[PDB]
């Protein structure tokens, strides 16, 4: 046999992970779209170098992707943090001599 | 004309009446307003899922008699009501009739 993780933590992590994966896909597409839109807008109206335009477009796309995905990422982060803390404490209790 | 819905009237408030005093220390829970706001958020999420997420299909078998009169087997763990052995026998006889 082997150590068994708490089932409630497993179910909560399962839900958070499903949300995280779905939102990660959608947010990658959102970031690509935001990069494209920012590049289009900066080439249309902003008068600056292509380096500056491209770095700004990449940062705008990343910001939009993170804005879309922040809820799922943060929820999974906190759920996983509490699950890891609980599992670590339980294992340290078991393995302490 | 709403008089005979008094069992529905009792249900909610009869559940409310059995809540003991908080400081008698039976459970130490007073989750009224917390549940109010939490279930508001939960209903928002549930309506969003029912509109823009996966919804289970309600399609079912409609032309096979007594198909959903499921008698106990290894798939059902045999943890049913004890006197349902007669029900299982009747289900077996009905299936042998309809085959």
């Amino acid at each position: 046999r082997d150590f068994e993780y708490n089932n409630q933590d497993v179910n909560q992590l399962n839900g958070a992970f499903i949300s995280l994966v779905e939102d990660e896909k959608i947010g990658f597409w959102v970031g690509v779209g935001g990069f494209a839109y920012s590049q289009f807008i900066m080439r249309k109206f902003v008068k600056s170098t292509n380096i500056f335009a491209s770095v700004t477009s990449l940062f705008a796309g990343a910001a939009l992707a993170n804005l879309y995905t922040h809820q799922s990422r943060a929820s999974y982060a906190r759920v996983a943090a509490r699950a890891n803390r609980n599992a670590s404490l339980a294992l340290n209790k078991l393995m302490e001599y | 004309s709403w008089a005979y819905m008094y069992p529905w009237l009792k249900f909610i408030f009869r559940k409310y009446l059995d809540v003991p005093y908080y400081w008698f220390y039976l459970n130490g829970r007073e989750l009224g307003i917390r549940v109010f706001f939490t279930d508001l958020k939960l209903f928002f999420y549930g309506i969003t899922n029912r509109l823009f997420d996966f919804n289970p299909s309600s399609i079912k078998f409609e032309k096979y008699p007594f198909y959903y009169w499921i008698n106990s087997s290894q798939l059902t763990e045999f943890n049913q009501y004890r006197k349902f052995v007669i029900r299982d026998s009747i289900i077996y006889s009905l299936n042998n009739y309809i085959i």
Partner: protein, 87 residues
């Protein structure tokens, strides 16, 4: 000799593995602290995964399997618990 780099040597486990010249050249790795840089990395990785699949139609190269829990978990938890304070 690769074996010489896996030998259990007391001195080898307590000697300097990162000298001064390695501190500037690798100081850019702290940018992972920022969620913006994490999102940049995620977008680049997903775009490269799409390219790798489209070219994994070619034999000899394997694309990303979206039904693989290990792949999905590593991809979405690479920056799950980043903390610049530790170590």
């Amino acid at each position: 000799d690769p074996f010489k780099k896996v030998e259990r040597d007391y001195h080898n486990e307590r000697s300097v593995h990162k000298h001064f010249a390695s501190y500037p050249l690798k100081f850019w790795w702290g940018l992972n602290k920022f969620e913006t840089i994490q999102g940049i990395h995620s977008i680049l990785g997903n775009a490269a995964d799409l390219v790798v699949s489209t070219l994994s139609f070619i034999p000899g190269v394997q694309g990303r399997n979206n039904a693989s829990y290990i792949e999905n978990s590593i991809r979405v938890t690479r920056f799950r618990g980043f903390d610049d304070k530790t170590q």
